[PDB]
Amino acid sequence: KCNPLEKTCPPNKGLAASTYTADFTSASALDQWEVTAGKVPVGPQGAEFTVAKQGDAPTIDTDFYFFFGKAEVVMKAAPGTGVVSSIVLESDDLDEVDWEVLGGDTTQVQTNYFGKGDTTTYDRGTYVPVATPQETFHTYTIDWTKDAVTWSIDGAVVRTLTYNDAKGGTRFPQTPMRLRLGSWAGGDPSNPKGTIEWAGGLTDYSAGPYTMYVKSVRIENANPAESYTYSDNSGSWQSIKFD
Ligand SMILES: CC(=O)N[C@@H]1[C@@H](O)[C@H](O[C@@H]2O[C@H](CO)[C@@H](O[C@@H]3O[C@H](CO)[C@@H](O[C@@H]4O[C@H](CO)[C@@H](O)[C@H](O)[C@H]4NC(C)=O)[C@H](O)[C@H]3NC(C)=O)[C@H](O)[C@H]2NC(C)=O)[C@@H](CO)O[C@H]1O
Ligand SMILES: CC(=O)N[C@@H]1[C@@H](O)[C@H](O[C@@H]2O[C@H](CO)[C@@H](O)[C@H](O)[C@H]2NC(C)=O)[C@@H](CO)O[C@H]1O
C-alpha cells in the first residue's frame, strides 16, 4: 500500500476489459480476487462474510483496478448490533467511495467518501432509506465519472457528489480504485467508543454468527488498461498514465 502523493509507486494492475462480472454462486468466482483476511466460503446465496468471533473481518479485494465506470454489487447485509457490511472502492492514494450497512439499523444504509485519506471531519456521510437490508438482497450501484459519483439502490439515485462538492474537486475520488467487499464488527469491544457508537452498539459474538451475502459483482471500466501509473504526486486523474 504505497501512497503516490508521498512517493513514486509501481503501476496498479488494471482491468483490461470494459466490463467484469462475477456470479458468486460459482467456485471459480474469486479467480480475480484475493482473500485479504479470514475465509470467505461460496454458498447458494453467494459469497459469505461471517463475523463468528472477535477479530473476524473477512474481506475480498479485486486483483485489478478500474479508472472511472460502474461498480454494482447485489448484497444482503449481515444482521447483529455493531456489525458492518461494507462495499468499498479504494485507490492507493486513499480515494474512497463506500456503502456501509449496520446490523441493528434495519431502515437505512450509509454512503460515504473521502479524498486522499482526508477524514478532517466525518461530514462526507449520508444515511438513505433502504428496506430490511439485513433480510433483503439489494443492488448497490456506484457510478463514477470525472464530473460526479452517483449512489443508486435498485436503480434509484440516492446520492450525487459532484466534482466541486469535494472541495472544488480537491477531495473528489479520481484515481484507479479496487473493489473490496467485507464484514467486520464496528461494535468490537476493543474499538474506540466512537466507532462502537457509530456502528450502533457493542457486538455479541455469542448472539449468532452474522453473515453478509454478495450474490454478484458487476464492474464497468471506463478506461480499460493493463496497468495505471501515477505520473506525479498531484493525485489527480490528469496524472494517470495508461494505454
Ligand atoms: C478512514 C476510514 O474511515 N476508513 C474506513 C475503513 O476503515 C473501512 O474498512 C474496514 O476497516 C475496518 C477497521 O479498520 C477493518 O477491520 C480490521 O481489519 C483488519 C484486517 O482484516 C484487522 O487488522 C488485523 O487484525 C488481526 C487480528 O485478527 C491481526 O492479526 C493483524 O495483524 C491486523 N492487521 C493489520 C494490517 O492491522 C482488524 O482486526 C480489523 N478490525 C476489526 C475491528 O475487525 C475492515 O476489514 C475494513 N473493511 C473493509 C471492507 O475494508 C471501510 C469499510 O467500513 O470504510 C472506511 O470508511
Ligand atoms: C475513533 C473514531 O474515529 N471514532 C469515530 C469514527 O470511527 C466514526 O467514523 C466512522 O468510522 C468508520 C471506520 O472506522 C467508517 O466505516 C464510517 O463510515 C465512519 N462514519 C462516517 C460518518 O464517516 C465517526 C462517526 O460519526 O465518529 C468518530 O468519533
Residue numbers in the entry: 24 to 266
Publication passage describing the model:
The best of these was a chitin tetrasaccharide (NAG4) soak displaying diffraction to 2.8 Å. Initial electron density defined the positions of NAG4 and chitobiose (NAG2), which were located in the donor (−4 to −1) and acceptor (+1 to +2)-binding sites on the concave face, respectively. The −1 O6 hydroxyl interacts with Glu123, Ser109 and Trp207 side chains, and the −1 O1 hydroxyl interacts with Asp121. The sugar moiety in the −2 subsite establishes two types of interactions: a CH–π interaction between the sugar moiety and Trp207, and hydrogen bonds between Arg203 and the carbonyl group and between water molecules and the O3 hydroxyl/amide group. The sugar moieties located at −3 and −4 subsites do not establish any direct interactions with the enzyme and only the −3 carbonyl group is engaged to a water molecule by a hydrogen bond interaction. The +1 sugar moiety is tethered by Trp221, Asn135 and Glu123. There are CH–π interactions between the sugar moiety and Trp221, and hydrogen bonds between the O3 hydroxyl with Asn135, and the O4 hydroxyl with Glu123. Finally, the +2 sugar moiety establishes a CH–π interaction with Tyr145 and a hydrogen bond between the O3 hydroxyl and Thr218. As suggested by the crystal structure, these hydrolysis products may still bind the +1/+2 acceptor subsites, thus excluding potential nearby water molecules that would lead to premature hydrolysis of the covalent glycosyl–enzyme intermediate.
